[PDB]
């Protein structure tokens, strides 16, 4: 990473990675598929040229948001180095490069937020997690708890209690008894087994820890909703 | 060498100059895989997986 | 997970059956030629 | 390339690497395909990869020289290959293993090229359109070519600048496709001689450019190369103006050797760039899309030289015009106007008529093909949209719809704005819409689909009732004893007899007698790539004359262009559904006939009523079973999959979406009807065979009793009924057990519905537990 | 559960792969005849 860009190198890297990710996962997202021209990134050493570059970047950013919704190059010229004499070369380069860079990064970040909210339904994913994984359907949770405690107290083995037929029957009954059990957000819930116990240990509080509720995240949401996040939720 | 095309033959001569003594049939198949626009990193991972089990 | 495994198994079974049907008709054609 | 070429290539690689076991070949295929992008989007830093290989290569100079050679030829996969070699050099263990496995394991040439290109273009042009040829004198007259005819130094250089040998500076003969070399008089001042040798590169570049222009201006080089040669000729003319100005200044005494050297610096750079482009085009034999790809890569390579970039942009824009004119003609008219086979789309003559006979969509996929090599790199991302657009317009054109793209505009190559990409996508979307509308409105896809539902899915129960009433006697005969005339007449009676006579497409409904019974066919299909394949191949075809009841299917005649959507693969799936419902109805009719016959038997002898109770209960278990299987197949598989198809067909964006939805519909109905599980299908087949045998036994007994040792006959009948009951119950419990197994291990939630229907009263529940 | 669904998917994927290879060879043979 260039030393003069070190203060912006990480943001540039994140922006480029995000742009490539958005193109790979949802290339037709309105944020991802916008033909809006991206502001030019160039080194400016004239204070007038630097202000003009900043203004053009700002105009480009504004136009793109609406659509989504000198140095050493002349001879007699003297302003071309006026910033270079007023400002130090590292500071001049920083001012010249990061302003258009910051404008483009900000536009990218805004479009990414919009894409995640509208196209990736991250809020809808959180709502689904609340409905199904957070047991927002209180009736389903009550039926599940009663059936689980009946099976655990009767000493059913994981092969008997956690049998896919038994687990599916319990899930169907809990969803049918839940007002939210038939919701499409509840459909993202899946009951999986971490391990198969030979015997349900009596009076063990962790007896049902073998059960896991998994939440599926599609691209690109699986970059943000990572397998680690789903594992912690489980 | 007759297994490799002239472009594939030139790539084989380049690979030899790169120090790779590759079989012309293996190189031909590799070129065909590259012609299918498969990412070379995935092809490398595939080659590594295929080779890792074959202890010399 | 479980619903995703169910979908993968169902899709793989459908694809294998479609390939088997295509093979069956290919073999019948090669037996007719 | 074959759809499964990657599977062959992987299998060859596994064999060549002596990898034990094909277990995991699917995993390597899945890794490569998941990581296979159709577009070369990976801008690999070939410079650093070259460097890594050169550090790794035992002959690093040769590696770098070969890389620059292949780049000058625009050799495909060069940078991917160098990256692969770098990755193998990174994996020393893999490289050692691979090494051990390997151990264990110009005028005449131009005339030949012209003749070859002419022959290739005529062979591509079956229509006898001879490619245009320049007359021989165009190539034979050397003074026309403009290359070197094999103060004083300033005068010679000003001549040399025009490609004329000077008196003290003379051009050497061109050895092959090399740049022209010049001989300078040794008695010139060393500084003067060196300045002449610094300027002579302009004359060498001019001579090279003129040879390139004169060669690539031949018709055989294609329209893109001709346009490139004309654009280069314009810059050479400007160069001649410049050289004439330097000559005029020299006549004025204003040109010194140092002034010439300074003033020629831009001309030297321009001519060097032109000679580099000429050499790259000539070495790569670039034509059509390959020339546009090379021009794009050169234009990107000049990102630091605004003058060189502007020149390369001008040349690329000029050379892309005829190729983009062909693209425009393709995307707006579905016409390939590629006289030299330069366009990314190649047309093949395929017979549309065979689409109904061929299970493969050969006509749709093989008639128009993409020439990957002829795809311009700037069009690489749009080649498929261009292909689909031209396919759609041609299909529309072949259905008698004239497709005029209202958005047809001239396509111009642009580097930063991919306006041609959006324009190709718009043309593709327009052509797709026109084709979909033609198929939906003119080919009445929904009306044909409703006809298929009416006949193939047995939606018209009154039709099937009438047909089976008229045809039952004829279909009960062996297929060899059946008179096809009677089946066609019973079909016509059923068509005229049903509400389908109001169907305008009823005449597309046909009777089809399958060569194999449905159960044997499905078991053979499902045994493919299974352990049962050998058992089905060695299973003698049972000498049981296939009955018309087991051979009966519908077929449906789909005309072009609708034969694109209702193809033989779709019709065969409809035939499978029809035959399945017909067989279910046959089993139901047999169970009802046994019921009626038993009701009649109960009326003739009061005393026999006790013996008939068991046969009645067996018939009732079979009837409830058959009706629940028919109900599942009709209302949860066929009806739901048809409703899904109609909804998806309503949501289709193009004809390929309609085809996809219809295939998904057929595949859903096939899946949900238990047709895809060989064990369930085999148990159902045995169950139905036992049901039919029971109904035939009950009918024979009731007929005997009506016509009428008798105690012995009754005990034998009861014993037969109890044996049928045992066999039916055993097969039913095995079916319910298999449905439960698939429901629990395979997550086939649909199988739980079959079980709940099959054991809706819990009759089998205690037996399943047992 | 999850491992059993994975095993069923793996068997179905092996069958699909073998079917695709056999189809590939069948198409190459029908293209050679």
Curated annotation (Swiss-Prot), chain B:
Mind telling me which GO cellular component terms the entry cites?
centrosome; cytosol; gamma-tubulin ring complex; nucleoplasm; spindle
Q: What is this protein called?
A: Mitotic-spindle organizing protein 2B
Tell me which domain of life the UniProt entry assigns to the organism this sequence originates from.
Eukaryota
Q: Which UniProt keywords apply?
A: Cytoplasm, Cytoskeleton, Phosphoprotein
- Compartmental location: Cytoplasm, Cytoskeleton, Microtubule organizing center, Centrosome; Cytoplasm, Cytoskeleton, Spindle
Note the subunit structure.
Associates with the gamma-tubulin ring complex (gTuRC) consisting of TUBGCP2, TUBGCP3, TUBGCP4, TUBGCP5 and TUBGCP6 and gamma-tubulin TUBG1 or TUBG2; within the complex, interacts with TUBGCP2; the interaction plays a role in gTuRC activation. Interacts with TUBG1.
Q: Does the keyword Phosphoprotein apply?
A: yes
Which family does the entry's similarity section mention? Belongs to the MOZART2 family.
As for what it does, the entry says: Required for the recruitment and the assembly of the gamma-tubulin ring complex (gTuRC) at the centrosome. The gTuRC regulates the minus-end nucleation of alpha-beta tubulin heterodimers that grow into microtubule protafilaments, a critical step in centrosome duplication and spindle formation.
Q: Which organism is it from?
A: Homo sapiens (Human)
Query: According to the UniProt entry, which residues carry Phosphoserine?
Result: 5
Q: Where would you say this protein principally sits, based on its record?
A: cytoplasm
UniProtKB/Swiss-Prot annotation, chain D:
Q: Name one GO molecular function term.
A: gamma-tubulin binding
Residues in a coiled coil are: none
An example GO biological process term is:
protein-containing complex assembly
Looking up Pfam families in the UniProt record yields: GCP_C_terminal, GCP_N_terminal
Q: Which UniProt keywords apply?
A: Cytoplasm, Cytoskeleton, Disease variant, Epilepsy, Intellectual disability, Lissencephaly, Microtubule, Phosphoprotein
- Its biological function? Component of the gamma-tubulin ring complex (gTuRC) which mediates microtubule nucleation. The gTuRC regulates the minus-end nucleation of alpha-beta tubulin heterodimers that grow into microtubule protafilaments, a critical step in centrosome duplication and spindle formation. Plays a role in neuronal migration.
Name the record gives this protein: Gamma-tubulin complex component 2
Give the source species: Homo sapiens (Human)
């Amino acid at each position: 990473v260039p030393v003069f860009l070190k203060h912006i190198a990480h943001d540039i890297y994140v922006c480029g990675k995000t742009i490539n990710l958005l193109k790979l996962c949802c290339p037709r997202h309105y944020l991802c598929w916008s033909d809006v021209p991206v502001p030019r990134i160039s080194v400016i050493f004239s204070l007038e040229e630097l202000k003009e570059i900043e203004k053009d970047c700002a105009v480009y950013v504004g136009r793109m948001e609406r659509v989504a919704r000198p140095q050493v190059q002349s001879a007699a010229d003297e302003t071309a180095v006026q910033l270079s004499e007023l400002l130090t070369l590292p500071v001049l380069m920083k001012r010249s490069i990061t302003a258009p860079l910051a404008a483009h990064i900000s536009l990218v970040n805004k479009a990414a937020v919009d894409y995640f909210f509208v196209e990736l339904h991250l809020e809808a994913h959180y709502e689904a997690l609340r409905h199904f994984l957070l047991m927002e359907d209180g009736e389903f949770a009550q039926s599940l708890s009663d059936l689980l405690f009946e099976k655990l107290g009767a000493g059913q083995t994981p092969g008997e209690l956690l049998n896919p037929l038994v687990l599916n029957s319990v899930l169907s009954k809990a969803l049918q008894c839940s007002l939210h059990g038939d919701t499409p957000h509840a459909s993202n819930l899946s009951l999986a087994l971490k391990y198969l116990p030979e015997v349900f240990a009596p009076n063990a509080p962790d007896v049902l820890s073998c059960l896991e509720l998994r939440y599926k995240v599609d691209w690109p949401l699986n970059i943000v909703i990572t397998e680690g996040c789903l594992s912690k939720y489980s | 060498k007759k297994v490799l095309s002239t472009e594939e033959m030139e790539l084989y001569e380049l690979a030899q100059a790169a120090g790779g003594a590759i079989d012309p049939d293996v190189f031909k198949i590799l070129v065909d895989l590259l012609k299918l626009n498969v990412a070379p990193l995935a092809v490398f991972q595939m080659l590594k997986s295929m080779c890792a089990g074959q202890r010399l | 997970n479980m619903k995703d495994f169910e979908n993968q198994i169902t899709e793989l079974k459908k694809e294998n059956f479609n390939l088997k049907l295509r093979i069956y008709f290919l073999e019948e054609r090669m037996q007719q030629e | 390339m074959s759809e499964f070429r990657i599977h062959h290539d992987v299998n060859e690689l596994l064999s060549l690497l002596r990898v034990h076991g094909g277990d995991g070949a699917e995993v390597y295929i899945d890794l490569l395909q998941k990581n296979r992008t159709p577009y070369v989007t990976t801008t690999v830093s070939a410079h650093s990869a070259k460097v890594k290989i050169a550090e790794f290569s035992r002959t690093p100079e040769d590696f770098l020289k070969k890389y620059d050679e292949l780049k000058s030829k625009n050799t495909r996969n060069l940078d991917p290959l160098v990256y692969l070699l770098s990755k193998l050099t990174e994996d020393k263990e893999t490289l050692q293993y691979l090494q051990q496995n390997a151990k264990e394991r110009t005028l005449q040439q131009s005339l030949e090229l012209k003749r070859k290109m002419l022959r290739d273009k005529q062979n591509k042009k079956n229509s006898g359109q001879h490619l245009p040829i320049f007359p021989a004198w165009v190539y034979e007259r050397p003074a026309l070519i403009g290359d070197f005819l094999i103060s004083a130094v300033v005068e010679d250089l000003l001549y040399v600048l025009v490609g004329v040998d000077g008196r003290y500076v003379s051009a050497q003969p061109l050895a092959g496709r090399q740049s022209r070399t010049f001989l300078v008089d040794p008695n010139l001042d060393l500084s003067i001689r060196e300045l002449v040798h610094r300027i002579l590169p302009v004359a060498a570049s001019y001579s090279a450019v003129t040879r390139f222009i004169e060669e690539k201006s031949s018709f055989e080089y294609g329209q893109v190369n001709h346009a490139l040669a004309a654009a280069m000729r314009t810059l050479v003319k400007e160069h001649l103006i410049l050289v004439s100005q330097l000559e005029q200044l020299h006549r004025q005494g204003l040109l010194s050797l140092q002034k010439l050297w300074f003033y020629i610096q831009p001309a030297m750079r321009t001519m060097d760039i032109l000679a580099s482009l000429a050499t790259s085009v000539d070495k790569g034999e670039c034509l059509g899309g390959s020339t546009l790809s090379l021009l794009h890569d050169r234009s990107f390579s000049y990102t630091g030289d605004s003058q060189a970039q502007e020149l390369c942009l001008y040349l690329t824009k000029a050379a892309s015009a005829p190729y983009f004119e062909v693209l425009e003609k393709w995307i707006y008219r579905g016409i390939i106007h590629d006289p030299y086979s330069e366009f990314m789309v190649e047309e093949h003559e395929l017979r549309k008529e065979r689409i109904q006979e061929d299970y493969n969509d050969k006509y749709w996929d093989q008639r128009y093909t993409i020439v990957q090599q002829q795809i311009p790199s700037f069009l690489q991302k749009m080649a498929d949209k261009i292909l689909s657009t031209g396919k759609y317009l041609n299909v529309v054109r072949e259905c008698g719809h004239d497709v005029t793209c209202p958005v047809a505009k001239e396509i111009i190559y642009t580097l930063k704005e991919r306006a041609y990409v959006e324009q190709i996508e718009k043309a593709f979307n327009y052509a797709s819409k026109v084709l979909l509308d033609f198929l939906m409105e003119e080919k009445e896809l929904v009306a044909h689909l409703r006809s298929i539902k009416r006949y193939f899915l047995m939606d018209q129960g009154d039709f099937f009732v009438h047909f089976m009433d008229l045809a039952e006697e004829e279909l009960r005969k062996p297929v060899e004893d059946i008179t096809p005339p009677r089946l066609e007449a019973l079909l016509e009676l059923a068509l005229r007899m049903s509400t389908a006579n109001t169907d305008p497409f009823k005449d597309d409904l046909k009777i089809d007698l399958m060569p194999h019974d449905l159960i044997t066919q499905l078991l053979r299909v499902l045994a493919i790539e299974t352990k049962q394949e050998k058992a089905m191949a060695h299973a003698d075809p049972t000498e049981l004359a296939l009955s018309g009841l087991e051979a009966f299917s519908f077929d449906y005649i789909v005309k072009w262009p609708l034969s694109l959507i209702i193809n033989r693969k779709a019709l065969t799936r409809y035939q499978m559904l029809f035959r399945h419902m017909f067989y279910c109805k046959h089993v139901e009719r047999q169970l009802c006939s046994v019921w009626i016959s038993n009701k009649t038997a109960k009326q003739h002898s009061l005393h026999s009523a006790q013996w008939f109770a068991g046969a009645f209960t067996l018939r009732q278990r079979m009837l409830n079973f058959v009706q629940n299987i028919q109900y599942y197949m009709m209302f949860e598989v066929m009806e739901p999959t048809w409703h899904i198809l109609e909804k998806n067909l309503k949501s289709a964006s193009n004809i390929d979406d309609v085809l996809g939805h219809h295939t998904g519909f057929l595949d859903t109905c096939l899946k949900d009807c238990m047709l895809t599980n060989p064990e369930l299908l085999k148990v159902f087949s045995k169950l139905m065979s036992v049901c039919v045998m029971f109904t035939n036994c009950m009918q024979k007994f009731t007929q005997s009793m009506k016509l009428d040792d008798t105690v012995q006959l009754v005990s034998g009948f009861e014993a037969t009924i109890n044996k049928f009951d045992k066999n039916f119950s055993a097969h039913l419990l095995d079916l319910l057990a298999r449905l439960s197994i698939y429901s629990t291990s395979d997550c086939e939630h649909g199988m739980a519905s079959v079980i709940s229907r099959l054991d809706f009263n819990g009759f089998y529940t205690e037996r399943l537990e047992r």
